[PDB]
Design a protein around this ligand. Structure first.
Ligand SMILES: CC(C)CCC[C@@H](C)[C@H]1CC[C@H]2[C@@H]3CC=C4C[C@@H](O)CC[C@]4(C)[C@H]3CC[C@]12C
Ligand SMILES: CC(C)CCC[C@@H](C)[C@H]1CC[C@H]2[C@@H]3CC=C4C[C@@H](O)CC[C@]4(C)[C@H]3CC[C@]12C
Ligand SMILES: CC(C)CCC[C@@H](C)[C@H]1CC[C@H]2[C@@H]3CC=C4C[C@@H](O)CC[C@]4(C)[C@H]3CC[C@]12C
Ligand SMILES: CC(C)(C)c1cc(C(C)(C)C)c2c(c1)[C@@](O)(C(F)(F)F)C(=O)O2
Lengths: 681, 669
């Protein structure tokens, strides 16, 4: 090529084979010269042709930096620089370019921090940092609908930045980030803080040699199974593991590693006219005994980029003078670098890695998801991101269980229910005393005409026992919730659940009061008098009933416990739930009625203090009444208190309310009317 | 008349545009010396400088102009810390020397990795052992940090970590960022922590706290440590790059804290150059608030340099490629040591020539002092000018106070009144019947036993006194002497009088369908109960025991959650042991009422006490039958078990013995 200058490339990388990274220093090059030879055979840049001046870096910043200076002073006017693999050198070089009107490109800046153009403007690259994995991860989570995460990193630049982007990308993307920690060197003082939440998911964005310590404490807290899936980068050295061997090997297996993709999977015609398989054949033929690269074809793509974007550049109106000012350029045409950058901001085409384009600097690229399937690593899927897609293949992945491990818990509701048999046991006892009630009916109504019938019009007493039965079968209505209930008309019964009680007790406790009141007020119409008395008593009854029932009187209020339940033996959570009902204001509408009936007792007990000076034994047994009254008085008040002070535990709330009533009604009434059978017999 | 060029690197913007005046300051120091003849017979120290901005890229450029197209140099004088960190690694591909005056990145003490570097600004590690002091003082133990992630700091913080692990302090959080500082603080507030350390630069910080006000991190429990070598007003100034005001940080940063280091010799001594800090400062002000505290290090540094040069002696006969002169002068500086403006100006790896520090607070508008300190003795001088909105240091976590559920002592007194009245009535009827203890309607009923009855009831009436009270300022130390007092007092009060009448009833079946057989029968009865007690009582006694409920959400104080606990004596097998006992005792009156069902309308005219006897007996029986399960079940609500508990007993006596002698009283008439 004699007509033109050799157009600038300033090449920077390892060259010796003293350093392990020195591998790369020569493990990539031959494909680079391969493309050079291709463009030699094609010669796009007619009238111009290309060339490169290689130098050493050694990734000790001094040597490479001096070498950079050296290639400056003792060389031609260069335009573009290629390379920068070791981090510390490139993070240096990046900012020195704004002073010389340069642009650079390279193929190892996984160091993400370079995204800030406001810091490092003139930089470009081809390889995707760890930053452009998060889109993939997001989409993965969507495709499994996992929606709760426990983040975890370790405090250095290169990872903390990843985290502080991920937090920024999930804005308006309906998943939370609950917990968080970090650490420097000792991780285990954190994983148990995390286990304290029993969370099901792990992100981990941390360097190689720490996984040992990580899982060594994990096993000692035992996070593994199905319920715990993990995410890690994939750029680790495969077979990286060389406190316990087998413990880990059993524990770890089944995670996800993730990283950049080396190459595509598809043999479509390229820009060159070639294919991946052709590429690697050309590769392995081009080498004999040198280690294999993985960040090479990206490089080749970049060289083709350099070519075509150069071509874009020289497609310029003032090509007349610029086709020489290539050559007389003295490191200082600011406009030129602006030209080049504006050019490449919209470069766009295909290569081995699919299309390759830029956004603020960064590649849109291709991704390797992998899983660790029983002592080896395997591909699992793929994520094109420029189209915001995904491809996953069956019969490849695996969990240790079978299902997507859900991310929260065995939450369960489990509406409590008082007394499995308590609907039955004591209710049958009620039926016992009830049939005794009907027995008293039979053996009472039999006689109906005898010396004892005139002692008392027994229809009054029939009414008493009527209210008895009513009050007495009220109980089962409290035997209601839990089973036999989803109707939501619970409020409907409760109205009845007091209506019945009120009436039965009221009437059947006024009757004998009025019996003896009549006996006195004659002695010191007869029967419809007492219907008048109770038709007035209805006014008190219904007036209080409906005043309570002003708005609703009954609001089904589900009350929630502490959700502190774990007793299933099934790894679940049951938020204990219960019910109740009030006038949705306060518990004031009750001492009213308790007082109303205490007044019945007392003014009825005016007859009692009469009886205490009456010469009772003529015809009746108010003595039999007084024991009853004191008994029931104290018992009812106790029930009234103990209920409201224990709306909480219902398991007994239904019992004690039974025992009070059953003792009251039965061992009052039954063993009071028994004398009226001793008489007959 | 010889002279030697120098290049050197300075600030004008960015992290520390303070050496604006140091540049003239060193010019002053320079023209000091060529005037003197003990300095150099021939050489006159020249200078070059360039602006850097503390942007290493532009600095790299100026460096390239310095070496590659610049005059022959030997030595360099840079500023901020990143830049030194660079050029040190850069040097040894020329075999230079270098010295910095400002930079404190501790990692540079690695003489091996960095052979040819010298400092005078001490390694900033000295900031730390200060800090632990306050962490030992105000009782703080759990912390979060953030930081910008340059080499200068990360190592500093890793040093912090161990320098408190010696004192077992915890670290439980970290963050990091480069220039988008927004999110990690948002991460912080959702890890709720109270304390903050920061370690960063100005033009970050303004942005930082600007954002911080938009998530409400200040005031009562949001304390911040920072750095002191900022300006004294850094936050007041216009930010062209945010959406904040002035007043918001003027109110939001309030309370924060700073530390820094004293550089000058605070004393008053003639210098080597016939100078002192006073006239020093005068000259600075003469040559021209920000960027001043730090200059003197030059006026020590270069003096030390030229002293090296009096030591050493060709000089213009130099090359980068040579190595020998560097080793000469490097041994020189390894040996170099004297006393100058700052103090005992000497070099080492610890960077701890100095020892004297500075604390500083901010209290509403500007910066102020609290005390000073020196680490060599752990000696802390204080001045007692602090402030907190609250009046005392908060503590990195809402602390839990473990109070007790009191027993509402305001009500205790009421039933105590009832107790006293019952006592009055008891002794009244007691001395009554024994006084007029001779009649037929009086002596023909054996009221001695009735007196016993009232007496036992008085004992169980005292039973309010011991057991109604723990959860107030009553004992707090010795419960068991009163705890067990419920038990002995009970039956000695209860079962005795209860059986005192039972004996009377026992005859109506056992006799009608003496009074030494009787008295000893009672002795057998009481002692039966008592020995069956003591087998469990003095063998298996109780003790004061504590129980607790769930944590709560008080919200009746500044910030502290409440964890109540309760207390009452019990042993580990009180499940059935205690209720079946109550049942045993109860069977007596169960049969007592059977005896009542017998002895109705059967007077027998011998003892004139059956009628309301049975009535009272029934009255008691129901109360016991009720109260046992109820105090059993309703124990976890300690507050009102007592409510029923003794009222029963009161409404026993006040409706038991009352009946006993009133007709007998009326029998007098
Ligand atoms: C004739 C008289 C003596 C009968 C009076 C009945 C009384 C004892 C009944 C009626 C209403 C009841 C109250 C209903 C509501 C409450 C509020 C609760 O937080 C404590 C119990 C308490 C305070 C109950 C105690 C017993 C009570 C006051
Ligand atoms: C038959 C008689 C003796 C029964 C009387 C019941 C009495 C003891 C009840 C009814 C109302 C109750 C009061 C309700 C309100 C208060 C105010 C509180 O700050 C102190 C307790 C105190 C003062 C209670 C003490 C006990 C109390 C007075
Ligand atoms: C016949 C007698 C014994 C029955 C007396 C019923 C008593 C035990 C009832 C009626 C009113 C009730 C009180 C209602 C209000 C309060 C205030 C609360 O902050 C503590 C409970 C307390 C103090 C209750 C305890 C039980 C109580 C005192
Ligand atoms: C305990 C005692 C006071 C002796 C008593 C108990 C009863 C019960 C039926 C409740 C067991 C009783 C009476 C007295 C009566 O004489 C009456 F007066 F109450 F009528 C009666 O027959 O019933």
């Amino acid at each position: 090529p004699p007509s033109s200058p050799p157009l600038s490339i300033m090449g920077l990388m390892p060259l010796t084979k003293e350093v392990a990274k020195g591998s790369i220093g020569r493990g990539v090059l031959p494909a680079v010269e391969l493309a050079i030879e291709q463009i030699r055979n094609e010669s796009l840049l007619r009238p111009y042709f290309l060339d490169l001046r290689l130098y050493d870096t050694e990734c000790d910043n001094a040597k490479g930096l001096k070498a950079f200076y050296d290639a400056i002073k003792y060389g031609p006017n260069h335009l573009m620089v290629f390379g920068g693999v070791c981090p510390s050198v490139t993070s240096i070089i990046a900012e020195s370019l704004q002073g010389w009107n340069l642009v650079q490109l390279s193929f190892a800046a996984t160091t993400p921090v370079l995204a800030d153009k406001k810091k490092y403007p003139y930089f470009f690259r081809t390889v995707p940092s760890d930053n452009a994995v998060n889109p993939a991860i997001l989409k993965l989570l969507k495709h499994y609908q996992w929606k709760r995460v426990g983040t975890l990193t370790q405090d250095v630049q290169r990872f903390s930045e990843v985290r502080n982007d991920l937090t920024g990308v999930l804005y308006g993307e309906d998943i939370e980030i609950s917990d968080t920690e970090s650490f420097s060197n000792d991780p285990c003082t954190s994983v148990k803080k995390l286990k304290g939440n029993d969370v099901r998911i792990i992100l981990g964005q941390f360097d190689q040699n720490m996984a040992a310590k990580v899982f060594c404490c994990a096993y000692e807290e035992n996070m593994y199974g199905s319920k715990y899936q993990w995410i890690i980068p994939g750029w680790y050295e495969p077979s990286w593991w060389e406190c316990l061997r087998k413990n880990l090997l059993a524990a770890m297996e089944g995670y996800i590693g993730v990283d950049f993709e080396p190459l595509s999977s598809k043999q479509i015609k390229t820009i060159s006219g070639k294919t991946p398989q052709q590429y690697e054949r050309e590769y392995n033929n081009k080498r004999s005994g040198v280690g294999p690269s993985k960040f090479h074809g990206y490089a080749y793509d970049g060289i083709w980029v350099i070519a075509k974007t150069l071509q874009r550049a020289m497609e310029t109106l003032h090509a007349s003078s610029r086709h020489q000012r290539i050559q007389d350029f003295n490191y200082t045409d600011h406009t030129l670098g602006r030209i080049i950058l504006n050019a490449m901001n919209e470069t766009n085409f295909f290569g081995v890695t699919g299309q390759v384009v830029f956004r603020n600097g960064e590649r849109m690229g291709t991704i390797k998801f992998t899983q660790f399937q029983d002592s080896r690593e395997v591909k699992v899927g793929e994520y094109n991101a420029v189209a915001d897609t995904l491809e996953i293949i069956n019969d490849t992945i695996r969990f240790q269980g079978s299902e997507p491990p859900k991310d929260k818990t065995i939450i369960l509701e489990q509406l409590r229910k008082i007394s499995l048999p308590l609907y039955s046991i004591l209710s049958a006892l009620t039926i016992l005393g009830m049939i005794m009630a009907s027995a008293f009916l039979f053996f009472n109504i039999k006689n109906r005409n005898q010396k004892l019938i005139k002692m008392s019009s027994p229809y009054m007493n029939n009414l008493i026992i009527l209210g008895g039965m009513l009050s007495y079968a009220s109980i089962f209505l409290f035997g209601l919730d839990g089973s036999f209930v989803s109707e939501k008309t619970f409020e409907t019964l409760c109205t009845v659940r007091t209506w019945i009680l009120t009436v039965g007790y009221t009437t059947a406790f006024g009757a004998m009061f009025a019996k003896t009141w009549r006996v006195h007020a004659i002695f010191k119409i007869k029967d419809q008098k007492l219907l008048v008395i109770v038709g007035g008593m209805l006014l008190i009854d219904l007036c209080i009933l409906i005043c309570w029932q002003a708005v609703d009187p009954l609001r089904r209020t589900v009350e929630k416990y502490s959700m502190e339940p774990d007793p299933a033996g099934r790894d679940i959570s049951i938020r204990p739930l219960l019910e109740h009902c009030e006038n949705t204001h306060m518990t004031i509408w009750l001492g009213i009625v308790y007082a109303y009936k205490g007044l019945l007792m007392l003014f009825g007990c005016f007859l009692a203090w009469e009886t205490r000076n009456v010469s009772i034994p003529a015809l009746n047994d108010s003595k039999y009444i007084g024991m009853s009254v004191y008994n029931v008085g104290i018992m009812c008040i106790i029930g009234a208190a103990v209920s409201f002070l224990t709306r909480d535990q219902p398991n007994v709330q239904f019992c004690i309310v039974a025992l009070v009533i059953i003792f009251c009604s039965t061992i009052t009434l039954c063993l009071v009317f028994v004398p009226k059978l001793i008489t007959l017999r | 008349r010889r002279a030697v060029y120098i290049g050197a690197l300075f600030p004008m913007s960015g992290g520390w545009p303070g050496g604006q005046a140091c540049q003239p300051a060193v010019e002053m120091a320079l023209e000091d010396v060529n005037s003197r003849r003990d300095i150099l017979p021939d050489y006159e120290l020249k200078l070059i400088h360039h602006d850097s901005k503390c942007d290493p890229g532009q600095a790299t450029k100026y460096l390239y102009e310095l070496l590659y197209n610049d005059p022959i140099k030997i030595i360099l004088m840079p500023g901020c810390s990143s830049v030194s960190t660079l050029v040190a690694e850069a040097a040894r591909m020329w075999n230079l020397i270098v010295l910095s005056y400002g930079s404190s990145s501790p990692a540079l003490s690695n003489r091996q990795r960095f052979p040819t570097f010298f400092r005078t600004h001490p390694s900033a590690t000295l900031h730390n052992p200060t800090r632990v002091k306050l962490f030992e003082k105000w009782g703080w133990k759990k912390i979060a940090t953030i930081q910008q992630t340059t080499e200068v700091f990360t190592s500093t913080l890793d040093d912090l970590e161990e320098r408190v692990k010696e004192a077992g302090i915890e670290i439980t959080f970290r963050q990091s960022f480069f220039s988008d500082p927004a999110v990690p603080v948002k991460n912080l507030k959702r890890q709720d922590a109270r304390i903050i350390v920061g370690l960063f630069y100005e033009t970050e910080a303004r942005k930082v706290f600007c954002e911080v006000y938009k998530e409400r991190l200040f005031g009562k429990k949001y304390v911040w440590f920072l750095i002191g070598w900022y300006a004294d007003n850094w936050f007041k100034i216009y930010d062209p790059s945010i959406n904040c005001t002035v007043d918001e940080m003027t109110e939001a940063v309030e309370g924060h804290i700073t530390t820094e280091i004293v550089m000058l010799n605070p004393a008053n001594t003639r210098s080597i150059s016939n100078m002192t800090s006073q006239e020093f400062v005068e000259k600075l002000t003469k040559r021209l608030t920000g960027g001043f505290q730090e200059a003197p290090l030059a006026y020590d540094a270069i003096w030390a340099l030229a002293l090296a040069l009096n030591k050493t002696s060709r000089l213009e006969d130099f090359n980068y490629n040579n190595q020998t002169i560097t080793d000469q002068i490097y041994r020189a500086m390894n040996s170099s040591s004297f006393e100058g403006v700052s103090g005992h100006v000497v070099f080492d790896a610890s960077g701890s020539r100095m020892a004297w520090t500075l604390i500083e607070q901010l209290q509403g508008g500007s910066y102020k002092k609290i005390g000073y300190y020196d680490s060599t003795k752990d000696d802390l001088s204080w001045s007692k000018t602090d402030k907190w909105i609250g009046g005392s240091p908060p503590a990195d976590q809402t602390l839990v106070i473990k109070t007790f559920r009191f027993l509402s002592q305001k009500l205790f007194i009421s039933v105590s009144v009832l107790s006293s009245l019952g006592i009055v009535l008891a002794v009244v009827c007691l001395s009554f019947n024994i006084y007029n203890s001779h009649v037929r309607y009086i002596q023909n009923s054996q009221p001695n036993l009735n007196n016993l009855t009232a007496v036992g009831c008085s004992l169980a009436l005292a039973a309010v006194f011991p057991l109604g009270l723990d959860g107030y300022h009553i004992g707090r130390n010795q419960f068991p002497f009163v705890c067990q007092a419920r038990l002995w007092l009970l039956g000695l009060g209860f079962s005795l009088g209860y059986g005192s009448m039972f004996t009377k009833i026992w005859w109506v079946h056992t006799v009608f369908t003496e009074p030494w057989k009787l008295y000893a029968t009672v002795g057998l009865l009481v002692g039966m109960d008592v020995l069956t007690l003591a087998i469990w009582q003095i063998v298996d006694p109780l003790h004061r025991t504590i129980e607790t409920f769930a944590k709560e959400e008080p919200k009746e104080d500044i910030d502290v959650s409440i964890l109540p606990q309760l207390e009452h004596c019990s042993s580990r097998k009180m499940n059935t042991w205690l209720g079946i006992f109550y049942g045993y005792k109860g069977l007596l009156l169960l049969l007592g009422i059977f005896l009542a069902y017998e002895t109705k309308s059967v007077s027998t005219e011998k003892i004139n006490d059956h009628r309301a006897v049975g009535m009272a007996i029934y009255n008691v029986a129901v109360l016991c039958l009720i109260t046992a399960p109820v105090t059993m079940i309703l124990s976890s609500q300690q507050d009102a078990a007592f409510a029923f508990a003794s009222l029963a007993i009161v409404f026993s006596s006040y409706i038991t013995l009352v009946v006993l002698f009133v007709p007998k009283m009326r029998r007098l008439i």
